[PDB]
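Practice problem: predict the structure.
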Amino acid sequence: SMEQVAMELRLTELTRLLRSVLDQLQDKDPARIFAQPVSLKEVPDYLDHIKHPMDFATMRKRLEAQGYKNLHEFEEDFDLIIDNCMKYNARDTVFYRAAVRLRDQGGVVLRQARREVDSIG
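Answer:
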């Protein structure tokens, strides 16, 4: 149908906007602490601590499959990255500190993306 195509064009454009958002958020992680999944070879007990792991490479795979239907879903995944880190790692660690900085700096990027998604439909 012509409606299914119009919907697919909307999802495509959302994916385009989320791709830019993701690149901007990931620049706020210059040390690449959140770039890839926590290694189960190197942290064998991680899944006993964290039930829903997340990282920027896993978000990128979902993105390119047009697996995000709205910004809320995308934010959920970003929020997992931060919140998982802040639970697993203690306050006085480079890891926890990196999460806090990502959170604070990403908030700005996400504040305007919410307006761009409401604005452009």
